[PDB]
């Protein structure tokens, strides 16, 4: 994929996620651009409490507790990569 | 809002930092976070640090850990040159 | 000398702007000379020319969109910290 | 193949032999896949081919002459060194 086309993933991937650049840089790139392993990595390490709180101040951005951020922001995962299995 | 042209800013620092010293995410944030996000003073920091020992080959996100290491000490002593002038 | 100081801070500059845009090295001259040798200008230079299409495919040592695309996205972003 | 330290040491030899500003120095010994003896022999030809412009010599006789001078000192400096590699 086109760097432009990457650059939207890593929107929508932060757009979900609510998580800083760094972090949706990261983990994308780790999961290979697939949205679907990058999603199920997200969620895996914050099982492991590798994603601190104010890792997920983006969530809601215009482009709530941190806590709360922090749990929302792993709902939505979990329902995006709900809809994008069938 | 301004608070969140604030998180922006801070945003685009860490991202540049990451870019410049191929630090994994956690590394960057503490980094930066210690140098009170003084993108300057957060170079400083990682040379600092790099020199004492403090930042570990598990840090850094073809090249071996001393390679990765090496280059991103040069980048950060490159683009810390710039903002001095 | 000053005067082998003075060239050490221009080689740098150079060296940097080349790392940021991806230039040939000629292009990367070009630029920074006609911005007076200030870097930050320099970079202002090259998102201005290149929205204005002043700087061809052919100048970026990825497909040539891309290495175009990377280069003003890595500008912005360094922009951006000398402007604060 | 070679680690960075290395590498940079290679760039700095290229750089005192052929008096270039890094920006060519690296452009040539990089297209060269670092090989030293291919980087001189691209350095000449490019040179050839008024591909390099006197100023870019600047750092010809650095510590750490005319612009034209410092040109065709390096462009001998080249030749000469490729001579030793070519035994």
């Known amino acids: ?6 650059d939207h993933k890593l929107l929508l991937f932060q757009e979900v996620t609510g998580l800083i650049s760094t972090w949706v840089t990261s983990i994308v790139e780790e999961a290979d651009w697939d ?3 990058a999603l199920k990595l997200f969620i895996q390490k914050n099982a492991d409490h590798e994603i601190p709180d104010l890792a997920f101040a983006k969530l809601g951005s215009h482009m709530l507790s941190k806590a709360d951020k922090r749990s929302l922001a792993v709902a939505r995962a979990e329902l995006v990569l709900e809809q994008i299995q069938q």
Do not use: I, N, Y
């Not at 994929?1 to 990457?6: A, G, I, P, W």
């Open 1 to 6: 994929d086109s760097l432009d086309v990457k």
């Open 35 to 37: 949205f679907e392993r």
